[PDB]
């Protein structure tokens, strides 16, 4: 019906300025207003502000004072949003909201804007194995730790996609401007340690691929 | 500013039961000229855009199925679902359009059921970790329910809270369960000054906490 195309993810350093666009198609730009909603902490939604493209009416929230200034484009039929003085708390996903009527509002796909003072490092992985000689469970669990990579994401598979069942991927945590994650799969005792398993991690931003046999 | 509160935060439901959500505002959101209530209910899928379901808190939008209906006016706002489906796993919000600035709700998420519990996932540190100058012992909590759980790290009988990195996952799509990892990192000479490391976790379905430990030497 109406398409709200935005920009992609951006890797910015703290101190610079980022610009977020929201392309409009299928409807006239000079009739309806555009709003912006900031989504923080996964679930919490914060209202940024709004702009009327015809009469240049601009209102902003008290939490976004001297930070967000809204600008519209009357020739390319798109909206612009720029941020000033980016800090560590601005790591959030931003959406453009189309205020058509009081009945329905359309949304975009969102722009992932992460900010860190951070260099791209190859991930260092270490295999994990239980140090006990015997156990009571019929299943043996294994894993491998992924530490020291930037940026998100890293695709972690097991045995080249053959051991797809029973895999558990944990979300990353930011520690000293770099993310760390882990994974755990369940293996029956009839294979380990007679049959070897491998960890396959992939980083397309660094173009590396290291295989660790456990 | 007009602030809104939502209750409850989370609730576990089955397939086919009735779900009622409550949104409450501190002031009246009723406009007296047209008897309209300026509040709309939201619904956001994991990985998709948030969409609207109920506008003016009592009417249904085109494209929304007949199971989503709303009632209430002024202060109390209720969203009642007649029969939930498998695709109803989403987070709901309520937003007022009465006065500027606009505020959002706290967020309500539904869950599934039930009865998952772990026993042992203790992993000792490997030999490749100590060559880099550090040490890291991990504790996973796989196949557990509910997500309300407390983890505790014990080192030679002493409690240590610094350096604990917790990570929770979402609900599984196969057995409707959760998974949680807890990683305690430290330096290399602190690992050699201690022998025993106890991984403690307390659960709701058990009357005794599960204790398990391992030795270095």
Residue numbers in the entry:
A (entry chain a): 1 to 214
B (entry chain b): 1 to 217
Article excerpt on this structure:
The S protein is a single-span transmembrane protein that protrudes from the surface of SARS-CoV-2 virions to engage the host receptor, human angiotensin-converting enzyme 2 (ACE2). The ectodomain of the S protein consists of a receptor-binding subunit termed S1 and a membrane-fusion subunit termed S2. The S protein of SARS-CoV-2 forms homotrimers on the virion surface and likely exists in two major states, namely the “closed” state with three RBD down (receptor-inaccessible) and the “open” state with one RBD up (receptor-accessible). By using a combination of biochemical, virological, and cryo-EM structural analyses, we identify three types of cross-variant neutralizing MAbs, represented by S5D2, S5G2, and S3H3, respectively, and further define their epitopes.
To investigate the molecular basis of S5D2-mediated cross-variant neutralization, we performed cryo-EM single particle analysis to determine the structures of SARS-CoV-2 B.1.351 S trimer in complex with S5D2 Fab. Three cryo-EM maps, including the SARS-CoV-2 B.1.351 S-S5D2-F1 (associated with one Fab), S-S5D2-F2 (with two Fabs), and S-S5D2-F3 (with three Fabs) states were resolved to 3.5, 3.3, and 3.5 Å resolution, respectively (Figure 4(A-F); Table S2; Supplementary Figure 8 and 9). Only the RBD-1 is in up configuration, which binds with a S5D2 Fab. The epitope of S5D2 Fab on RBD would partially overlap with the binding sites of ACE2 on RBD, leading to clash and spatial hindrance between ACE2 and the S5D2 Fab. This is in line with the high potency of S5D2 on blocking the interaction between RBD and ACE2. The surface property alternation and side chain enlargement induced by the T478 K replacement in B.1.617.2 may break the interaction network with S5D2 Fab, leading to reduced S5D2 binding and increased resistance to neutralization by S5D2.
